[PDB]
Design brief:
part of a larger assembly, 12 chains, A mainly alpha (about 55), B mainly beta (about 325), C alpha+beta (about 100), A: about 55 residues, mainly alpha, G Protein Gi Gamma 2, about 0% strand, elongated, C: alpha+beta, six-stranded antiparallel sheet, 2 helices, globular, BTB/POZ domain-containing protein KCTD12 (chain D)
Chain lengths: ~55, ~325, ~100, ~100, ~100, ~100, ~110, ~325, ~55, ~325, ~55, ~50
């Protein structure tokens, strides 16, 4: 009731006081991870049949 | 009144966070990845068809060896499959024919399942425990280890369980709707949960508190999955869209949607490198999304009924889809 | 501030002295108008964070009285313009109520 | 002094010229207004202790004529704004039909 | 002379609208006023004026001809309600009842 | 010239959910003098071409298959929509009848 | 400018096991094509009827957004009014489909 | 302007015909026959029940000997019955199970049938003989002039006169704007009238192949038509629940046969030998006996659980045969 | 097009110019037919069983 | 003048009672129990699953030995169960397959049942019919044995009844309900009993004197179930309005309402625990919710059933809670 | 109906003429009952297996 | 590799076949390699036939 909407407020204060980072950097960090491991992902770069258990 | 003050105060803080998120957005994911060569067309094919389920399959979870997998069907049976030989390793009868989730312990010694019975059952592979106390139905569960399992329920709370004895080591509260799915972080320190309140929440497992809350979905969030590095997660939803959220940026990076896909997403899973986002849909298909470019890279249609669950092996060699039809299919 | 708001309920009937039973009243429209019309009666449970001036469909009423919801709009400057019955079968029943400027 | 009133009946038919058969008229709305226009015709048997100005849905009419209820509302200051009918369904079939009638201010 | 009248028809067809009979329902004082000899008082021929009824029908089978007589005797259409859902060896039947509300 | 006219169509759909409205043909029903007035030579007298003006009918239809195109001709021929009723019930195929009432 | 516009959608519901809300797959816009661009601007999705000429009636448009009252409001503030409505609904676990129509005048 | 001129002439001509028909009516049929003693109550009873049809019976046609008859059922079979002994004379399998009509040649050597196959099949009674094609619509009705000529009606709005020997259409009858459901030959087989979905009946000249008169006043499709015994009048059954008697010389509608509480279409009509009784099959499962002059119900025949699809009366007038979708045929007396 | 509305007219012209007769006479001739043959119609005056094929 | 006096008096008496109840309320049950440490989550589990019913189970009633129990199913059978071994003790064919209630005599010699047959049938276990109690004009919603010779019934005819089983005649007729009476519950001393009904009110009756003493209101729909608080000074009501309401006899008013958002379904049955701290309610949503009586919070839930829970029972010793449903199964919860 | 509405009065008289008690006390008496017997209720405080017929 | 259903197909020769799909695009295929040779784009709706 009243107790419940008061805890939500105390929550939002915690949610607000956080070190935010620019999308530009976030994305840059994701994008760079993807290329690092892109050759280790068989769903992107198929493997040979001899190396494919499902063959 | 006193509630009107707390309402207006809570709303104003929402605007403060919204404006902080807007100031943080200098560019978008689509802008920075526009110069990246697209994935192109990656053709997959059904290499294995697992038969022997007699009813709707509501959940699947791969093993850590990328060999064994578990499935939960509405016939009241759990079947552990050998995905290489298509041999049934185990068939466990369930006391409740209604089962919404299953999980495979990382050690491979235990397997869990649950559903409308409001019970998380831990099965020993070498019933063991029935974890009660959830006031809602059990939507999802994931093993931290043989002694710990994290569950989500329709009572709006998640939970950390001690499998040996006792219950609910840490209770996670603050969701205003049914919690449909959860996905653990790579280090098992944190986990995110999607729910029917159209919001996703990042939780601290050790400290038992909500850290960040992600919004922007227009309907229930039926699925959630962590990006491989643990800094981002993708959500499937009944609004026909999949959305990638970033933890550090604390906002929505990208929306995966198409004018011709007007149906809810039951499950989401990343590929090993995270470049491909896989989503099971109610339209009987499974759409392969480019995570960076937000374009459709392919489709998997092997099923005659809606795709209820997805999974990707830890080695990333195969993608398994599961649907309401008897069959279960391993793609590659 | 002219706008549209739509409310509706779903009936649960099974195989007359059976009265109208309304399980939940759904409120549908733009979220800015819904706050004004119904104040704190509406239940933001299933869509708490919808921004004002952004349309929604996931709002319901903490009370179960259809005409009490109707009356609040009649002297909040709304008028009943249309209704649609969609009934099929235990019996499912969806009827809708449209309120204008 | 302004409000909404909702009346309706449930049709029950078994199976061809069949007239409208009205078993009972249900009255739904705020209990202060419901008493005003129909007086003692209302049968508060199902919900007789509700205080004035709090809403109800459990009242019915001692008479079985829908237009007699319509007229009493037209001459106590009400107007018809909408209508909705919901009817669906060892050898013969049974017909279940619910229709609703909404009256304003 | 404020009042109400409600008419309706029962449509059953295995294609144009085919109306078997038009039922006229309301107070019998107003029902006699708006329509003339067309009413078939057979089912309810002794109802005293100012007592309500529901058992009259029209000797003609044209719905808009009934509509027109009421709009030219001071009635207007306020509401409508359709209720339709549904024995041979091959095909079935389709019953359909729709209603028409006329005010003041 | 006060009168009532009503138009309607019958929908036929298969299920095996993006299908747009399937308008097979529009049925026009009312008094035949008014029906010719609003629609002129567009209406198809094939089923009832010998009807004398001022006698009601129900067997006309429109050579075009656009419902709102029919609505507009009546909106600027001095008609207004006062009621609507849909009767839809039903691998078997869906059958849906919807009706539209126009005044004066 | 005088004219009629009609909007509607298809509702698919499945319940075997209410808190199920209105879920609108797509908004269909139906009327003359000249008015349709007027009220809705660039929101209209002309995907399956792009080439029709202005002043020629159509029935093959839909809206890039899935919010009924957002479509309702755009017409209420472009000089339209709601004249009629009609729903047509018919239907192990079993599935259900509901269709509703919305008429807008002048 | 050129299309309007030809239309306005048609409207004036229609109004001109309207005034001529009204001037001819000084009195009505009901007035002149009011003093005729009504038939009263003439009781009939089921004297024969024909079994062995497995589906809906869509048509019947009597023979000229007032004994043999043919029936067309939707099981795909034609059965020729001996009405006296209820013996099946012939059972002919049909290549298409959708059959809307059957006919018995006056000589008794041949029988025809047709339906949604758009084909009139001539069967030799002394295996298929002729298949008459070229109709673009379904075949609603057919009647033999003789063994070499047969007149058909179709859903393509046209009737046709056929040469059975060659199998080609001799004379095509045009001018109906709707599906032609039924036809009936005149006693001399020189003329024939046809009912259709355009709510009009048309008198045709067989030799010259042109419409002479057109009869109107029906409010729905005319599913059945039958000539009055003397050939000066005909009665029409329709979906409007009424039967209407038209006179050829009077060129207008003489009388309407209808009764409250019967709100259903008429599938078939047939006169008695003297023409005083008009029999009409109805969708309400009954068969009503009408007084032709007095427009009153003289009786009813209810033997069937489904609608009566076809009627017939023998040339000697001894028996009335009904047929229905309940697969049974009943001979009434 | 034009050919069709001209053929309909030429038809209606024929339909109008016809020798009509008064209903009064028509009916008189019909009514007299019925009574003429009323003894030849077994559906009006039932026959004996010995004279009834269906008995 | 005689009608004018009696009419105005009825209005004043209603207003007097309304004002007296408001003056008595200084505080609420939730206020005084707010400082009470909550029970927490006390878990139950299915210890027994009783099978062999072929249709919807409409009623259950425990025996006084906390061992035997009876069940009423719409297949037309009463089955006496041994709850320890799940053995069928008796299978009694019913002459009417429509049965809305059953009762187990405290002595264990007799069992009663009734339903749309408007008959309370007493079965002698020491199995054929013994007595048929007629005269109820409505269906039999509930019945409870006072002793071997007397049983109290409730009916859809708006009247309750006290029966003499020996003679088969109604001893005391209860005529104060204005709607169908769905349930009744006896007081600990069997001197009084409370009844829920379709008039959205509960009425306390005197068995000996046969009159309504107090009338409790506030429910928004039919009251389908009623159960006495262990000490007999309070009772709880289940209803179609999705709420359970605890009423106090001495205070003559509503103490507490038990409800939760997202629970939009009627309550078929209510029963207290032995200490009265837990109130269990069967619901139409297939669950059975365990409510904290003092704190008004949900402490747990029992969902074992595929269909709606039609009836509840708690043993006199309070060791087990038994549920029954339309899924043909009975479940004993611990 | 005067005999009938006079018996209704005597009914309401009974409901009015009663010694009522304060809610505060009622609740206190219930609250004190529950704690008194809280150890005798196995549904709150589980019992030993030797004391559990079902386990 | 077609993201929509396959509505129609026609063989050019044994090594080449042209397809149409509900994803609004047609395609020219090299059957041996299994890859699309020439992709046909520019339809705004599902392609039913070719």
């Amino acid at each position: 009731s009243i107790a419940q909407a008061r805890k939500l407020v105390e929550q939002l204060k915690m949610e607000a006081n956080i070190d935010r980072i620019k999308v530009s950097k976030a994305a840059a960090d994701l994008m760079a991870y993807c290329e690092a491991h892109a050759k280790e992902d068989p769903l992107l770069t198929p493997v040979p049949a001899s190396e494919n258990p499902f063959r | 009144s006193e509630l009107d003050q707390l309402r207006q105060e809570a709303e104003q803080l929402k605007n403060q966070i919204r404006d902080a998120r807007k100031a943080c957005a200098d560019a978008t994911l689509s802008q920075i990845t526009n110069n990246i060569d697209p994935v192109g067309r990656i053709q997959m094919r059904t290499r294995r068809t697992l038969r022997g389920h007699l009813a709707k399959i509501y959940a699947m979870h791969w093993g850590t060896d990328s060999r064994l997998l578990v499935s939960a069907s509405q016939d009241g049976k759990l079947i552990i499959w050998d995905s290489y030989t298509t041999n049934k390793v185990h068939a466990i009868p369930l006391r409740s024919s209604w089962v919404m989730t299953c999980a495979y312990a990382p050690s491979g010694n235990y397997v869990a399942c649950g559903g409308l019975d409001n019970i998380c059952s831990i099965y020993n592979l070498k019933v063991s425990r029935e974890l009660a106390g959830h006031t809602g139905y059990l939507s999802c569960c994931r093993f931290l280890d043989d002694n710990q399992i994290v569950t989500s329920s329709g009572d709006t709370t998640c939970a950390l369980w001690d499998i040996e004895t006792g219950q609910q080591t840490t209770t996670f509260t603050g969701h205003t709707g049914d919690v449909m799915s959860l996905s653990l972080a790579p280090d098992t320190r944190l986990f995110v949960s999607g729910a029917c309140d159209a919001s996703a929440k990042l939780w601290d497992v050790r400290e038992g508190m909500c850290r960040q809350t992600f919004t922007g979905h227009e309907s229930d969030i039926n699925a959630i999955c962590f990006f491989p590095n643990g800094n981002a997660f993708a959500t499937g939803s009944d609004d026909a869209t999949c959305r990638l959220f970033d933890l550090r940026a604390d906002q929505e990076l990208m929306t995966y949607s198409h004018d011709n896909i007007i149906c809810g997403i039951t499950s989401v899973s990343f590929s090993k490198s995270g470049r491909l986002l896989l989503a099971g849909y109610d339209d009987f298909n499974c759409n392969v999304w480019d995570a960076l470019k937000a374009d459709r890279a392919g489709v998997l249609a092997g099923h005659d009924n809606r795709v209820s669950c997805l999974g990707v092996t830890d080695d990333g060699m195969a993608v398994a889809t599961g649907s309401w039809d008897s069959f279960l299919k391993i793609w590659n | 501030r002219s706008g549209y708001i739509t409310i509706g309920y779903r009936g649960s009937y099974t195989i007359d002295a059976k009265f109208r039973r309304v399980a939940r009243i759904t409120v549908c429209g733009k979220t800015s108008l819904a706050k004004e019309v119904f104040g704190d009666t509406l239940n933001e449970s299933r869509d708490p964070d919808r921004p004002p001036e952004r349309y929604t469909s996931r709002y319901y009423l903490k009370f179960n009285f259809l005409e009490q919801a109707f009356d609040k709009l009649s002297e909040s400057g709304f008028h009943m313009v249309a209704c649609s019955s969609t009934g099929t079968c235990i019996w499912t029943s969806y009827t809708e109520y449209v309120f204008c400027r």
